[PDB]
Amino acid sequence: AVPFRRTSKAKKRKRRTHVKLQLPGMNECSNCGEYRLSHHVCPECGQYDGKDV
C-alpha cells in the first residue's frame, strides 16, 4: 500500500491528460447583446425569453 518507485515526469504528465475542465456553454442574448448561458435567466438585463422576470 506504499509506492515502490517514484513517478517520472512523463508518467505524471500522461495521467493528467484528462484532468482538464470543459468550456462553458455560453451564448448571446438578443436584447442586451452580451454573453449568456443557455436555458438560464440573463443576469444583467435581468430577463428570460423577453419577459423581465
Partner: protein, 112 residues
C-alpha cells in the same frame, strides 16, 4: 511602436496548480470572449484572473493607445511564489507539514 501590453499579479494566495487549470481556457481567445469565459466558470481562480486580464486591457489603451475591440490573448502563464510552511497535528503526538502556496499570474494582450 508598442504592440502589446502586460499585467502581472505578484504573490496571489492561490496554489499554482489550481490557477493553471483556468488559464488554459482563455489562451488564444479574444478579450471580449475570454472575459465571459471566466465569468461562467465556477472556480475560485476566475475572479483573480478576470481582474488581471481587465487590467492588462486598461493599460493597453491608456498607455499605448490600442483598440479594445481588436485584441486577443497571446501569452498567459502562472508562476510559483514563496510558499508558506505550516503544520497540522496528527494522531499520537506527530505533526504533518502543510504548504500554503502562492502564485504569479501574467496576461499579455495584443492586436491581431
Amino acid at each position: 511602436e508598442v504592440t502589446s501590453a502586460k499585467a502581472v499579479a505578484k504573490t496571489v494566495r492561490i496554489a499554482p496548480r489550481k490557477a493553471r487549470i483556468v488559464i488554459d481556457l482563455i489562451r488564444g481567445k479574444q478579450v471580449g470572449e475570454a472575459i465571459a469565459i471566466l465569468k461562467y466558470t465556477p472556480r475560485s481562480a476566475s475572479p483573480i484572473i478576470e481582474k488581471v486580464l481587465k487590467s492588462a486591457i486598461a493599460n493597453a489603451e491608456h498607455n499605448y493607445d490600442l483598440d479594445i475591440n481588436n485584441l486577443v490573448v497571446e501569452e498567459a502563464f502562472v508562476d510559483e511564489g514563496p510558499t508558506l510552511k505550516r503544520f497540522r497535528p496528527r494522531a499520537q503526538g506527530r505533526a504533518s507539514a502543510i504548504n500554503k502556496r502562492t502564485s504569479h499570474i501574467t496576461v499579455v494582450v495584443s492586436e491581431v
